[PDB]
Amino acid sequence: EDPQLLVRVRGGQLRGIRLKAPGGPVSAFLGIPFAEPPVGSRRFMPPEPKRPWSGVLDATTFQNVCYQYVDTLYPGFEGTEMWNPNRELSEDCLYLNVWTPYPRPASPTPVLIWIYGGGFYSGAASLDVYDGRFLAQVEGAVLVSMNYRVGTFGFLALPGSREAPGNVGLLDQRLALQWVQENIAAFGGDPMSVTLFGESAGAASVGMHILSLPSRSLFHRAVLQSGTPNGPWATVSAGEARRRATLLARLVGCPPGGAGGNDTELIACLRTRPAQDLVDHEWHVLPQESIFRFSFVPVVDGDFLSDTPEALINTGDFQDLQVLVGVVKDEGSYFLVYGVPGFSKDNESLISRAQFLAGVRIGVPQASDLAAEAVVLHYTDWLHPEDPTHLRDAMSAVVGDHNVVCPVAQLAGRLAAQGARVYAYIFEHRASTLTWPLWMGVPHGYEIEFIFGLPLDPSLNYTTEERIFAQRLMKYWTNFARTGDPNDPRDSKSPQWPPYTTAAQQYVSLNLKPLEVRRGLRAQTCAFWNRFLPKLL
Amino acid sequence: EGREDPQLLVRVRGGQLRGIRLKAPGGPVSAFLGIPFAEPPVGSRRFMPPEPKRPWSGVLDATTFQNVCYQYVDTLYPGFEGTEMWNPNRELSEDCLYLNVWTPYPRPASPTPVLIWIYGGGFYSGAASLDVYDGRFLAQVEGAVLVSMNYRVGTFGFLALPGSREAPGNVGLLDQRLALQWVQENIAAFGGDPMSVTLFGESAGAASVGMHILSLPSRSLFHRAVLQSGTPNGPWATVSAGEARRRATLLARLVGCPGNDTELIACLRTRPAQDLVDHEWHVLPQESIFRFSFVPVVDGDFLSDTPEALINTGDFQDLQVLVGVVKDEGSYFLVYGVPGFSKDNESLISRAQFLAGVRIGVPQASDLAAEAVVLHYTDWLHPEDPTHLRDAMSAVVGDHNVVCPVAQLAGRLAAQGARVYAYIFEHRASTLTWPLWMGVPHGYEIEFIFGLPLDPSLNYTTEERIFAQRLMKYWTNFARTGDPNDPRDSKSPQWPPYTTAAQQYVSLNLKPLEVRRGLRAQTCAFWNRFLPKLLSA
């Protein structure tokens, strides 16, 4: 009966479990509920605060993973499985986790809050790669992660309606952030030094808390890894959200043969369907064949997001904000295998020129013929117009540039111009344990395990250099949480990480060599995506 | 005759000529200067095809250059060598259809390869009698027979009412062709070999050479071609029938000339030559640079279709061709009409001046096309940087008008079965009078090819004297064999053919031949493949 594992939060008492990290113990409080389960009449609805409970709630195990699509492209392949749910699915999933140092910090400690990715259609706070025991132990961080609704359950909107207003997955996140303001002190976290971090759709979510006023009072700093609120995939208009919602309805027999009058009736019908029925048809609502496009995503609703994220980053005022943003070396490789003909994890996917032109209409699905051609003409190496290696690598780059790198460059530029303090990075180390082929390089998400400190687990078989690398990254991130600046006060000469600016455009390479400072982030090519391409439409 | 030099009396089809013995550095040469090849195109013959020169009686004196064809005389910079060197150096007259021959002394016993020079001047100026076209060095050092002709420029050679009998257009091209015919019939009198005739020319001379390649009746008159910094395809070398009619009609109005093409032309014929020169520049549809009012027309006669159409669909089996560019094709005309630019300072310009310069250098571009140019050539790390802008302005004009047309031509020709050799000339004359920033402007390779540095009274450096010999060797080797390489000397590095697969070309400078690949390949994809489509929107 360890009093270190016994905490009273506002809703009552919790019992944690004592977990072991390589260099000592950590206290963990797993599966704490922060909301009423969003089930039955509450499906598609904003989350409500969890009611207080009697006695001592057992918070010693991860709670259920939110209901979602499960990947079966390569069944039993570690590459894909590591992202799949590692707990039972259930709409009753609004739970968070807290790792803290053992014994619980003497003074108030900066808090990191993690927001998983998964395209807004998948993910869970309980995956091995998001294990916060290492940051808690080695760096003394209080780490929090939360589940949020994904797919139709988190993101299906009939904008304007009372019963399905959209963005509820994001509100799940916001409620977990409120939960932290009110309760993290009890675990010895500092509600006054809260840093959000997230990757891919997680990073997009972080960016939305930045652009949504009611979230701004709940954190002080942000880290966006390989994702942004602006750009092609992360939001949809009200019009288009209505369209997919009503189309998902029609596809699952809602309403019987009316069909729709109003939203009230349509939503009522949608609530009566088994979770897996919605999910069965989640993927049939996209307007085009595509990759890096996802059916149910935050919506520009004039509420959570008062205007488009583009509009909001152009005019916002980010004076008292520190932000850390970066991308990996190969943002685009991963999704190629999910629907670009010619691509597979098994061979080396040396593609033809025709496969490349058809792959571009899939990668830039909203591109008109002329825009399509601009992209091809830009990305072809004219010295070797037909070399299959070049063509395979350019395909990857089209997707990564369009979806991640250029949106990130755009965000970094705007935030810096409007007064934020920005640090930017590219991550270039391919993990030795990686099970994807070499041609995919460093795919998105394969930095997370390093930031989270997994290589410090002797049992996991990372090279000894990788362990030292991971130590560095955890220092950068937690220094950034502590101070707003990833640089290490005690340390010199081994170069400083300079702020990113519109003028100098400096970012650093994160790999096994010490920091290298580079200038301009795909600057010519992003001028193409961010300045010319819009104008061509 | 009786008392004069036996080597200097020659008979041609039209009569008897007395040439002159001239000093070259390494010995004497024979020159026959001002041989008439046409009836003077005056009075009622203005705007009409040339007629062969009627035979004459007695011995025609061919010891001095003849008239220069009537043209605009530049005065932008009085006393300034850099511009003066291109200015007429004999009387301006419409009676200008003369040509010049240089051969060894004594004339060679066996037939010698003939090189025929076609001067540039944008189709509005030029003269075979400029110092930099002095044939004596190629004649003396390489034993070449060199021939150069005057051809009508400006209105006199190019004003066209397409379809009319009295001003069909392209007559300047016809003067050139008439001199090619004269060489066929008469060059053997001089020891020239009519079965080994190589055309070389620079700028509008190069575009001229290319017109002859593309025009069947000119085809039988030569075997090999050199095009220096110019092409028959591209934005300035030709105008449509419509546009030619429009400029001709406007010029007519501007000088007081009112259905009938007949009475319009008849009226133009009564106008003094200087009147047409005075209005020559007022007929261009836009403010521009690298655009000329009267240039070859696509008449469906001389040019059976556009040059672009004829290069794509023509069979170039029998053709060996040398093509190339200088380091800075665009710098020269920047001082003529892009505000910000000058010979007398370093011409650092602003972003505003650059955007304006782009509308002037690419006068046919829509707003969108122009914004594509500006996007492409902006350096997004240093987008306001005046040195880069100044150089980018040069590159836009140079690439659009010369470097990319040359690549499109080299490519199409190589694919249609021609042997193509390619170069970029990079040596700046030690004597050049333009400021440093202009680099190697077009035209400044010419004095090297013709071997002027061999005249010890000319102030070139010793390495320039050797470099000139190298180039004269390349050119006359090319004329001799269709291969610029020295057949024995496998010691020196080989100039390989340009091919679509490897796109090889050589650098010409003081260092030995170095081999490079792709001619602005990426950038030329922009001008040659993309930009056309953006001009179908």
UniProtKB/Swiss-Prot annotation, chain A:
Catalytic residues identified in the record: S200 (acyl-ester intermediate), E331 (charge relay system), H444 (charge relay system)
Keywords from the UniProt entry: Cell membrane, Disulfide bond, Glycoprotein, GPI-anchor, Hydrolase, Lipoprotein, Membrane, Neurotransmitter degradation, Secreted, Serine esterase, Signal, Synapse
Keyword Cell membrane: yes
InterPro entries the record matches: AB_hydrolase_fold, AChE-related_enzymes, AChE_tetra, CarbesteraseB, Carboxylesterase_B_AS, Carboxylesterase_B_CS, Cholinesterase
Gene Ontology BP terms: acetylcholine catabolic process; acetylcholine receptor signaling pathway; cell adhesion; osteoblast development; positive regulation of cold-induced thermogenesis; receptor internalization; regulation of receptor recycling; retina development in camera-type eye
Swiss-Prot/TrEMBL catalytic activity: acetylcholine + H2O = choline + acetate + H(+)
Membership in a protein family: Belongs to the type-B carboxylesterase/lipase family.
Oligomeric form and interacting partners: Isoform H generates GPI-anchored dimers; disulfide linked. Isoform T generates multiple structures, ranging from monomers and dimers to collagen-tailed and hydrophobic-tailed forms, in which catalytic tetramers are associated with anchoring proteins that attach them to the basal lamina or to cell membranes. In the collagen-tailed forms, isoform T subunits are associated with a specific collagen, COLQ, which triggers the formation of isoform T tetramers, from monomers and dimers. Interacts with PRIMA1.
Protein name per Swiss-Prot or TrEMBL: Acetylcholinesterase
Gene it is expressed from: Ache
Swiss-Prot record, chain B:
The keyword Hydrolase appears for this protein: yes
Family annotation (InterPro entries): AB_hydrolase_fold (IPR029058), AChE-related_enzymes (IPR050654), AChE_tetra (IPR014788), CarbesteraseB (IPR002018), Carboxylesterase_B_AS (IPR019826), Carboxylesterase_B_CS (IPR019819), Cholinesterase (IPR000997)
Topology versus the membrane: Peripheral membrane protein
Annotated GO MF terms: acetylcholine binding; acetylcholinesterase activity; collagen binding; identical protein binding; laminin binding; protein homodimerization activity; serine hydrolase activity
SUPFAM superfamilies hit by this protein: alpha/beta-Hydrolases
Disulfide pattern: C69-C96, C257-C267, C404-C524
Keywords: Cell membrane, Disulfide bond, Glycoprotein, GPI-anchor, Hydrolase, Lipoprotein, Membrane, Neurotransmitter degradation, Secreted, Serine esterase, Signal, Synapse
EC number: 3.1.1.7
Subunit organization: Isoform H generates GPI-anchored dimers; disulfide linked. Isoform T generates multiple structures, ranging from monomers and dimers to collagen-tailed and hydrophobic-tailed forms, in which catalytic tetramers are associated with anchoring proteins that attach them to the basal lamina or to cell membranes. In the collagen-tailed forms, isoform T subunits are associated with a specific collagen, COLQ, which triggers the formation of isoform T tetramers, from monomers and dimers. Interacts with PRIMA1.
Note: Synapses usually contain asymmetric molecules of cholinesterase, with a collagen-like part disulfide-bonded to the catalytic part. A different, globular type of cholinesterase occurs on the outer surfaces of cell membranes, including those of erythrocytes.
Protein name as catalogued: Acetylcholinesterase
Organism: Mus musculus (Mouse)
Gene giving rise to this polypeptide: Ache
